[PDB]
Design a protein around this ligand. Structure first.
Ligand SMILES: *[C@@H]1O[C@H](CO[C@@H]2O[C@@H](C)[C@@H](O)[C@@H](O)[C@@H]2O)[C@@H](O[C@@H]2O[C@H](CO)[C@@H](O)[C@H](O)[C@H]2NC(C)=O)[C@H](O)[C@H]1NC(C)=O
Ligand SMILES: *[C@@H]1O[C@H](CO)[C@@H](O)[C@H](O)[C@H]1NC(C)=O
Ligand SMILES: *[C@@H]1O[C@H](CO)[C@@H](O)[C@H](O)[C@H]1NC(C)=O
Ligand SMILES: CC[C@@H](C(N)=O)N1CCCC1=O
Lengths: 420, 592
């Protein structure tokens, strides 16, 4: 049912569908080292991708329904030059007729144009003054459906955002060739990332959109704050989803010391461009592989690892005394060789028992494979102290709403641009 | 009907005067004088507490504008409610009973306010303390009056106003000896803090408790017993006065010759009792506005309102003008540095009262600096670094910040007015109030001294009044002191420095006290014993309302002109004196 499906292969991009669309790539198109299937396009003339379909699959009808889907990552807009600067990123318009997707300051726009030059636009808007954003510099699954008889709808991460009737539009022509290049951007230092572009010749409903979302989400692999793969031997800042205004900190080294959630977070401001919350505050959490036999650095589900903790550019280890009062027992950062038999092993969990994708969670366990429990925080005399407990497991078994067992890993990224 | 009841009151008053003459003046009267003086000292103390604790309570409670003014004005609203309430209740429950209840309420809520952490709760506690203390003056004066013979009533009643000045002096001394120790940071509960001004509040709440303890040992006034149809205990109290007086004299052998005293003939349950009390109090209040007392009541209302308005307006106006003059002198000394280009170098300093304009600092790290009234204008900060910056009354206006970091600084968003920040980071902001709270330092000391001086100004005139009350009269003393108050009000223009303001405050305070004494004595003597506390409390509530109005009006006029306060005070005092000159003479009469 898919007509175009650009996927990575041995140093090239290949169409999965049985049409053999010709693909040509410029000399300045980049690829991520870990996830080469993600494509980086910069604001230059040579950073281009042309895809040429066949004459038998060119959209030239006017009752024909169609859908597109992709994943996009857009960096933060830093200064006022980006304001009122709508620039096209994907174009399929010839003779002033076709479909296109473009980006503006906090906006993703889908545009349809027929031969009578009538424009229909569907927009998704995300703010930039939020403390913590779900869209800024993070991967977004965008799927757009077009029913020529009822409406045209946009879906962000599988949920409907906007919909606009297109029954007035006439016959829509489409180019023989589809564009991938930043066009019309005045900012000379603005880039995007796109991956997993698919085209279908019929309108997707919510069910197929959700299955496509889960299929392309890679639920079996842990993800960081930016949506990229989680890796070993890389420092990550820690974020609690239930309590996102505080950062992980330590006060003393050893069993007598505890790590807690200290706040409030700082802010990064550019005077009506963004008012975001500082993400590089606290103590870095490095992941060390212990029993994962995979050769790659990618952290997968159910991996049993160790968690080093960076205090004054010195590496310590997560451990707790399995035997103390209560179930919600304190976590501590201690010297690497002096740990002995304290519980180190952490199981990384990304998807639930049924296979539904959720955020990153850590399950502390002992040397005997007994679940100490999920890692979270508990308030002891007005201090949010990091604790491993089986209360979260009990709530999960009861299908109740857990409180604080969900964590987020934030590596340092160029698309965020915060000063460390 | 009316004639018989009038004759009964007249004969009862005459026999009561004869009994009081037989008992004579002595130790009992002086003991009751000291007890009621403590009760009045509590009221004198109560009016200074919020004014003395506001400079610390603004920082300790994040008090903004429209909240400091309400805190300053709350004691007078509470007093206005309490004076009327307790004055109405004292003619149906008894002077001593209502005095004990009101003083206990004041003590309880003043103790509660000393530990209260919030603002609205502090407002409620202080309003209730004002309600408790509002009923002190009317009940105390009407209670002391009913033990005095006609030979010396103005003198012995005017001697009772020394304790108000004593309470003012006590408040000033306690503020001077307690508040300046800001180091005291007693910790009971992590979220709560115990500073020195709370200790000052406790020490100011003490005298009300002492007054209650002293008053528990005094008997009810016999006149209230006689009015309400209770004859045995009135006779017992009058006898007790007799034995106390003559045992103190040195003749503990004579016998109380009075055998019978003429007495006014008397003609769900909780709700019924409350309704009956309310109806009776309303009847007393309306009978205060009766055919016999309608000229008197309106003239007393005029005199009370005008004198209270003028006095409280000027009393709150003098310190405000001293503060305004000090602020003007401070702003005259401000230094200005227009333009300065600074390269890579670390900055430490403590700057006071400076304005730097058009600065350009490139890669400058400001470590550990305290700013007091320092303003940066039209400046540009690039790749700067602010660490351990503490600032009061410091603003960054027209400033542009690029790639700067504010680490461990209290430079909140309200300190960047019309500024532009680009790629700037705020990290580990210090705990502080969301808005400005100003700062008061050593300048508090003189304030206490000033208050002390004002209270001392009262000391001479009191003496003179107490030594002359029965010699000239209440009307003449009232008029001759109001006229001098008006003259001193006109003399306000001949002063523009702090010393001149202090001298003018001393002059006005020393002049108006004789008029206040005369008004107290005249209000006591002009009403029957079955309506004395009700009328006195209603007039005192009117006085407190006029105090609120005058304080607001005179504080709104600071720094604008010196003609409006002078005109208002002089006009009000002239009207009050004109109305007072038309009052009847009560000297040389039985307490009827
Ligand atoms: C605001 O900063 C961003 C990110 O730069 C980082 O943050 C700064 C506060 C400072 O600490 C820099 O050293 C950091 O690298 C700027 O965007 C990037 O600027 C660099 C220039 O060094 C450039 O190489 C990148 O390509 C830019 N990235 C993007 C997505 O444009 C931004 O320019 C700064 N704003 C202004 C007005 O200068
Ligand atoms: C503050 O800096 C000056 C020079 O910038 C230096 O001489 C002085 O010693 C510093 N203060 C202290 C307390 O060292
Ligand atoms: C200061 O403000 C004026 C107008 O208020 C403006 O013209 C000027 O540019 C500002 N200063 C700087 C350094 O920009
Ligand atoms: C007890 C004295 C009292 C009064 N009601 O007369 N005073 C004296 C100065 C101002 C005031 O209220």
């Amino acid at each position: 049912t898919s007509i175009l499906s650009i996927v990575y292969k041995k140093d090239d991009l290949i169409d999965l569908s049985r049409y053999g669309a010709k693909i040509n790539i410029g000399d300045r198109v980049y690829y991520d080292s870990i996830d080469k299937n993600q494509i980086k396009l910069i604001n230059l003339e040579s950073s281009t991708i042309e895809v040429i379909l066949k004459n038998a699959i060119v959209y030239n009808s006017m009752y024909e329904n169609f859908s597109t889907s992709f994943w996009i990552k857009i960096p933060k807009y830093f200064s006022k030059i980006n304001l009122n600067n709508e620039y096209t990123i994907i174009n399929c318009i010839e003779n002033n007729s076709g479909w296109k997707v473009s980006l503006n300051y906090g906006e993703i726009i889908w545009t349809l144009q027929d031969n009578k030059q009538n424009i229909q636009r569907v927009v998704f808007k995300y703010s930039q003054m939020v403390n913590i954003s779900d869209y800024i510099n993070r991967w977004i699954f965008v799927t757009i459906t077009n029913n020529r008889l009822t409406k045209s709808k946009i879906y962000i991460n599988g949920r409907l955002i906007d919909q606009k009737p297109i029954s007035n539009l006439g016959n829509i022509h489409a180019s023989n060739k589809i564009m991938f290049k930043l066009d019309g951007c005045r900012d000379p230092r603005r880039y995007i990332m796109i991956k997993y572009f698919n085209l279908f010749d019929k309108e997707l409903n919510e069910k197929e959109i959700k299955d496509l979302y889960d299929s392309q989400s890679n639920s079996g692999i842990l993800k960081d704050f930016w949506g990229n793969y989680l890796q070993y031997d890389k420092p990550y800042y820690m974020l609690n989803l239930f309590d996102p205004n505080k950062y992980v900190d330590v006060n003393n080294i050893g069993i007598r010391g505890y790590m807690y959630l200290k706040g409030p977070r700082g802010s990064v401001v550019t005077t009506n461009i963004y008012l975001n919350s500082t993400l590089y505050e606290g103590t870095k959490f490095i992941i060390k592989k212990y029993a994962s036999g995979n050769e790659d650095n990618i952290v997968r589900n159910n991996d049993r690892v160790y968690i080093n903790v960076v205090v004054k550019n010195k590496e310590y280890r997560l451990a707790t005394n399995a035997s103390q009062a209560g179930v919600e027992k304190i976590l501590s950062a201690l010297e690497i060789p002096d740990v002995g038999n304290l519980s180190q092993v952490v199981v990384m969990k990304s998807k639930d028992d049924q296979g539904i994708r959720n955020k990153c969670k850590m399950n502390l366990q002992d040397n005997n494979g007994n679940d100490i429990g999920f890692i979270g925080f508990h308030l002891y005399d007005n201090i949010a102290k990091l604790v491993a407990s089986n209360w979260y497991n009990r709530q999960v078994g009861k299908a109740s709403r857990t409180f604080g067992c969900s964590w987020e890993f934030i590596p340092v990224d160029d698309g965020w641009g915060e000063s460390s | 009907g009316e004639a018989q009841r009038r004759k009964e009151r007249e004969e009862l008053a005459q026999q009561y005067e004869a009994i009081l003459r037989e008992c004579g003046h002595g130790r009992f009267q002086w003991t009751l004088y000291f007890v009621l003086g403590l009760a009045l000292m509590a009221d004198g103390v109560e009016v200074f507490v919020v004014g003395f604790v506001l400079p610390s309570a603004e920082k300790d409670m994040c008090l903004s504008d429209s909240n400091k003014g309400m805190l300053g004005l709350i004691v007078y609203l509470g007093m206005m409610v309490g004076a009327f309430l307790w004055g109405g209740l004292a003619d149906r429950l008894g002077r001593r009973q209502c005095l004990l209840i009101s003083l206990s309420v004041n003590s309880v809520f003043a103790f509660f306010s000393s530990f209260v952490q919030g603002y609205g709760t502090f407002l409620f506690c202080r309003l209730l303390s004002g309600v408790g203390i509002g009923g002190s003056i009317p009940i105390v004066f009407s209670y002391f009056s009913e033990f005095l013979a006609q030979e010396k009533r103005g003198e012995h009643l005017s001697w009772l106003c020394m304790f108000w000045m004593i309470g003012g002096v006590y408040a000033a001394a306690m503020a001077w000896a307690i508040i300046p120790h800001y180091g005291w940071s007693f910790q009971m509960g992590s979220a709560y803090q115990f500073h020195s001004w709370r200790v000052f509040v406790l020490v100011c709440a003490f005298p009300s408790v002492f007054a209650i303890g002293a008053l528990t040992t005094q008997p009810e006034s016999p006149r209230f017993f006689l009015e309400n149809g209770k004859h045995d205990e009135a006779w017992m109290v009058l006898k007790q006065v007799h034995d106390t007086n003559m045992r103190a004299k040195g003749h503990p052998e004579r016998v109380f010759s009075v055998t019978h005293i003429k007495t006014i003939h008397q003609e769900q349950r909780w709700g019924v009792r409350a309704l009956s009390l309310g109806g009776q109090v309303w009847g007393n209040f309306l009978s205060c506005f009766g055919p016999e007392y309608r000229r008197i009541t309106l003239m007393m209302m005029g005199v009370w309102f005008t004198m209270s308005f003028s006095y409280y307006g000027l009393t709150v106006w003098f310190p405000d003008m001293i503060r305004h003059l000090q602020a003007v002198d401070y702003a005259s000394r401000t230094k200005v540095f227009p333009g300065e280009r600074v390269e890579h170098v670390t900055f430490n300093f403590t700057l006071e009262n400076q304005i730097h304009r058009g600065g350009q600092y490139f890669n400058d790290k400001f470590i550990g600096l305290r700013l007091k009234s320092v303003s940066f204008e039209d400046s540009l900060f690039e790749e700067c670094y602010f660490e351990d910056v503490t600032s009061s009354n410091t603003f960054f206006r027209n400033c542009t910040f690029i790639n700067t970091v504010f680490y461990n600084t209290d430079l909140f968003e309200y300190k960047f007015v019309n500024s532009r920040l680009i790629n700037s980071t705020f990290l580990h902001n210090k705990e502080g109030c969301p808005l400005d709270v100003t700062g008061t330092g050593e300048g508090a000391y003189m304030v206490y001294f000033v208050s002390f001086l004002g209270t001392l100004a009262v000391l001479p005139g009191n003496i003179v009044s107490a030594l002359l009350m029965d010699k000239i009269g209440r009307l003449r003393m009232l008029a001759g002191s109001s006229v001098m108050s008006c003259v001193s009000c006109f003399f306000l223009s001949f002063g523009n420095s702090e010393s001149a303001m202090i001298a003018l405050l001393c002059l006005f305070g020393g002049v108006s006290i004789a008029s206040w004494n005369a008004l107290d004595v005249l209000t006591v003597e002009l009403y029957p014993s079955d309506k004395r506390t009700t009328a006195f409390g209603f007039l005192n509530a009117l006085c407190k309302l006029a105090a609120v109005l005058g304080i607001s009006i005179f504080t709104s006029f600071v720094g604008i002109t010196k003609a409006a306060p002078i005109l208002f005070a002089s006009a009000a005092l002239a009207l009050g004196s004109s109305l007072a000159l038309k009052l009847p003479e009560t000297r040389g009469q039985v307490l009827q």
